[PDB]
Amino acid sequence: EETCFDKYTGNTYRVGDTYERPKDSMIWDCTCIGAGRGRISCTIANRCHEGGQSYKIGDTWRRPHEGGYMLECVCLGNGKGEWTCKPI
């Protein structure tokens, strides 16, 4: 019967449920903790957010060097949403 409600997903969760949440132009990994308070813990630490997009650990993507060559970027995570871009 104990639930969390997430207005960003519009869904009701049980204790221990995990889900993805859209917020602040990023995707968060959230967990319904409950604690009698609908408590939710969410994080972006295990995803990368660059150039307005959201990436998972191991994803790579391309972007022009703001020039004028392409960069290849990779999502590392390392507990702080770390990503790196270098010329290819």
Binding site: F5, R37, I40, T43, L71, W83, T84, K86, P87
Partner: peptide
């Protein structure tokens, strides 16, 4: 040539919804 590395601070949140 440039290299760029990004990360996030304040990356983990807790809120109550009930």
């Amino acid at each position: 040539k440039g290299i760029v590395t990004g990360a996030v601070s304040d990356h983990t949140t807790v809120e109550d919804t009930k």
